[PDB]
Design a protein around this ligand. Structure first.
Ligand SMILES: Nc1ncnc2c1ncn2[C@@H]1O[C@H](COP(=O)(O)OP(=O)(O)O)[C@@H](O)[C@H]1O
Ligand SMILES: Nc1ncnc2c1ncn2[C@@H]1O[C@H](COP(=O)(O)OP(=O)(O)O)[C@@H](O)[C@H]1O
Ligand SMILES: [K+]
Ligand SMILES: [K+]
Ligand SMILES: [K+]
Ligand SMILES: [K+]
Ligand SMILES: [K+]
Ligand SMILES: [K+]
Ligand SMILES: [K+]
Ligand SMILES: [Mg+2]
Ligand SMILES: [Mg+2]
Ligand SMILES: [Zn+2]
Ligand SMILES: [Zn+2]
Lengths: 531, 531
DNA sequence: GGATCTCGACGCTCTCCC
DNA sequence: AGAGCGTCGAGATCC
């Protein structure tokens, strides 16, 4: 909500030191957007909140000032693997930093305690969990004693959106960080986040007891990324063959990421690509630091070409020259797909974001997110993105980023913008009636229909007992019928029915709520068909 | 082959009449190469043999002299279809000509007989079968009467290669044709042919008793023709879709020819092209004269865009502005492909020769040509042409016309010459060992394998009984495997085994004779692939 | 008559998250 | 336990 352009100077007393720590210590060349302004706000002793996408370079905005200020910097991070992620790079660069989780032994805990009060303990960044602030009586004590000794000067809050309710990813410990700025007022506070709306940001400002605060948000639009949606072949081996052909065609030798829904799927793709001559490796977030360094250094040294990652996992893979991100299966939500695909083309040059749309993936993910009360809705948003053939994909993604998406032209940088066929709207009402006929007949016979059984009964296949008498199967291929059934699902003419078995959660199809709209013979249902 | 440059007039006693008949009677502008010289040797009262490709314009070389001399010219034609074709061309032009076969009615025979001795008879060309000469005494008597009356002066023997028992199909009746030059020595004889085969050319000089005569042959190389080979999709509808796409992309509005292997194939192809918006028309040599005129007037007036014909013996389509000849299936032989594709670009301008190579076409045609003792070898030459991706197609075709093909540079007039692909010899011996393992096991389980069954067992598909225990299916697509199997068949590492059923001939695959060449470890089977 | 493609019925496999 | 997949037998179509 603030204008960072006024802070994009280098004439501050600290700008020389900042530039060198960036070039000779951090081994970087020039600042990414909003980094210099955020750093300049922090070095001036003011609080600042930075909203910036994952993989953008948010961490530097507090790591570099910690090396330009005196003493140490406290970093509130909620999860331990994420900490170790930062710590690896931190003292791989030669920056003495440390960690405090619940499970650290007494040796290290007392060493850290003595180092906070030490005068040239070379330590510059202490990462701690919010429980260490909320539920540790005297961690606060020597925090205050280091403050009085001018050693405690900066606070960095990761995932600041976790402070506010009417928000998601709420960690309750985040209430108690309001003590920090209350007890440490001269210490400058910086909060960083990638998923935050201003309505939540202001609540977090109130919660942290930071009223006057700058708010910089980055342009989430990445014009160098090309968004594309491709059909997912039902055969897994044909799918891997198509992936290998695409990689060898467009991205021969270029580094890339392949996102899979499951860990089994990612291991699966790693070995399959390896057998077909594409050097690949797997990466896991709940990983040992060392094998993280292993997969990372094999990727950087181009020893392997493609990194196979899991959806809610990646969280630390960071390569500037990622030329393509292939989604082996669609993501749980549109925001998740944005943050996942966006890790590509961090060098601001052209990169491709390919997504493979599979009919069965819809119901796998739907069956997986049943416990999330909004999982199905966000998944249907993703499915509607995959089904859309006319709108520019950048606009579709922008629909979920109203506050952080600059209204910029796509410049023919997505498959729909380049697709030079205009479309026409087919009346699909007959197909909906036929599907409802099938579903009601299966309901009468006490039979539950999986999407596959519904499709087969529609095509005159599957169990003869489940077929409606005299229903002529449509003249369209399986894929088109799948898109039609998906469309009916989104418009809620059909609805999902989850059944919980001892082994897994199965998703059947049932007549939807809006189906009664068909009682109107004048009711028309329209779809947009390729030419 | 004689030197025709000395016969390149314009100063002969008949050159005025020749030019007048060419421009005012035949409505032509300029002589095609070797037309002038041949007509001149004929008008000087000498015998001549003309070798010119199908569609070159050979008929004029005997039609024009008959219109400059007095009386009529006898034309020996083996088949009735070519007779009706020439009768069309002559009757439209207002040139009175007639034909007399065994199946001609009584009064028509009487009419021709009375017309021969008639002095004021407007008849200029009498087409007859060699049986009319061999097995008709009354016809020979009328020929004698006309010869002595100075009305019969010229003899034209079409498809003269039929005299020889070495050329393409030999007619026994043609053996008797040697009586003509024996009974009418002052009558000038011209023999026409498209298959040069100079052994055959010395023959039927022997048979016709014309051994001392001029023999002109044309340059078979057509530099304006671009030779290309494309892949035939296994699905027939994708096949027709590709044909429509090619025509609408490259050849909007241009006249074209589509050669099909089977009659029903050509019919189907017309109907499917019409359904897709390409005005098409079918043509068969054994057609009524009226509908042949129908199809030709629809083609000339651009009322139909493409003409689909089956590869029979007797395709007189003969249109000057044929911009593309697409072979829906490969041809039985290389010479056949040349003669068929050569109908393109008769105006000496650029024209395309598209060839659709299908794996199953090999075995249709091999099953069809089992009685021709050399049919399989020539079909394999065709297959070797289709498989070749490096050598210039012009050189490959010219290898079969060594005496009549001038060694001229292609100048990027074929698909392989224009592509700038570097090539690499891949070792494929392991694939041959695997295939031989499969076929040998199928012999062990005492079963015969069709090409489809062998390729399926190679890919781990089809009947489990026919699968090799430990054979891993190759990582290449099915079509690449079709390419490998075709290469092994051509090189005789595999062989065909025909089985005769009550309604068709099946083609199975068995271990080939050269397979034993693998006893040596140093034996390598290389295949040239893109790099 | 045999290959080739469908249908259908029976046995078998597997059970998708971070 | 249920859904889905692979495999084989029986029927239909074609030459
Ligand atoms: N100014 C910059 N120039 C070049 N690379 C940068 C810059 N800032 C950050 N990076 C790189 O981006 C990668 C990911 O940044 P990170 O700090 O993880 O951002 P976030 O915390 O938003 O995920 C890091 O490996 C870092 O080396
Ligand atoms: N000199 C020429 N100029 C223009 N067209 C010609 C010439 N000679 C022949 N043609 C045309 O070529 C077509 C086919 O020739 P044709 O006599 O059938 O040769 P062939 O007997 O070798 O098939 C004829 O329709 C004719 O009109
Ligand atoms: K300022
Ligand atoms: K692209
Ligand atoms: K061309
Ligand atoms: K040549
Ligand atoms: K095949
Ligand atoms: K066959
Ligand atoms: K079926
Ligand atoms: Mg981040
Ligand atoms: Mg001819
Ligand atoms: Zn766009
Ligand atoms: Zn060439």
């Amino acid at each position: 909500m603030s204008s960072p352009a006024s802070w994009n100077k280098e004439d501050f007393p600290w700008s020389g030191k900042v530039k060198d720590v960036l070039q000779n210590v951090f081994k970087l060349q020039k600042f990414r957007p909003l980094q210099l302004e955020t750093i300049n706000v922090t070095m001036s002793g003011k609080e600042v909140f930075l909203v910036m996408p994952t993989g953008g370079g948010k961490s530097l905005c507090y790591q570099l000032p910690a090396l330009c200020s005196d003493g140490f910097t406290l970093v509130i991070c909620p999860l331990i693997s994420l900490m170790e992620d930062q710590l690896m790079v931190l003292k791989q660069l030669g920056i003495s930093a440390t960690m405090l989780n619940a499970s650290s032994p007494k040796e290290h805990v007392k060493w850290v305690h003595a180092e906070m009060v030490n005068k040239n303990s070379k330590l510059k960044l202490i990462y701690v969990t919010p429980e260490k602030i909320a539920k540790s009586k005297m961690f606060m004590s020597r925090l205050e004693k280091a403050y009085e000794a001018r050693r405690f000067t900066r606070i960095a809050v990761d995932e600041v959106h976790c402070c506010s309710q009417w928000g998601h990813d709420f960690r309750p410990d985040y209430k108690a960080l309001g003590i920090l700025k209350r007890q440490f007022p001269n210490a400058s506070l910086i909060g960083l986040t990638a998923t935050a709306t201003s309505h939540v940001l202001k609540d977090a400002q109130k919660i942290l007891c930071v009223e006057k605060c700058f708010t910089f948000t980055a342009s989430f639009n990445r014009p160098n990324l090309y968004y594309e949606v491709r059909q997912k072949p039902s055969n897994t081996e044909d799918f891997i063959e198509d992936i290998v052909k695409l990689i060898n065609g467009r991205y021969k030798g270029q580094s890339g990421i392949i996102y899979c829904f499951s860990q089994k799927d990612s291991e699966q793709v790693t070995i399959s690509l390896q057998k077909l001559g594409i050097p690949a490796g797997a990466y896991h977030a709940n990983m040992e630091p060392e094998d993280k360094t292993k997969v990372h250094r094999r990727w950087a040294a181009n020893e392997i070409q493609v990194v196979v990652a899991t959806v809610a996992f990646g969280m630390g893979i960071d390569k500037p020259d990622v030329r393509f991100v292939i989604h082996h299966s669609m993501s749980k939500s549109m925001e998740n797909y944005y943050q996942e695909s966006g890790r590509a083309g961090r060098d601001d040059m052209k990169a491709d974001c390919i997504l493979y749309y599979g009919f069965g993936d819809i119901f796998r993910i739907s069956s997986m997110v049943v416990m999330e009360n909004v999982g199905q809705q966000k998944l249907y948003e993703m499915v509607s993105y995959c089904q859309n053939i006319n709108k520019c994909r950048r606009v579709l993604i922008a629909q979920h980023f109203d506050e952080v998406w600059s209204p910029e032209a796509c410049n023919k940088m997505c498959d729909n913008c380049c697709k030079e066929i205009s479309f026409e709207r087919k009346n699909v009402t007959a197909y909906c009636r036929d599907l409802i006929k099938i579903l009601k007949q299966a309901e009468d016979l006490n039979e539950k229909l999986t999407p596959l059984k519904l499709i087969d009964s529609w095509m005159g296949k599957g169990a003869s007992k489940l077929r409606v008498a005299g229903l002529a199967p449509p003249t369209l291929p399986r894929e088109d019928l799948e898109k039609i059934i998906a469309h009916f699902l989104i418009q809620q003419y059909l609805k999902e029915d989850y059944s919980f078995t001892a082994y897994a959660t199965i998703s059947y199809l049932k007549v939807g709520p809006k189906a009664n709209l068909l009682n109107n013979e004048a009711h028309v249902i329209t779809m947009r068909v390729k030419k």
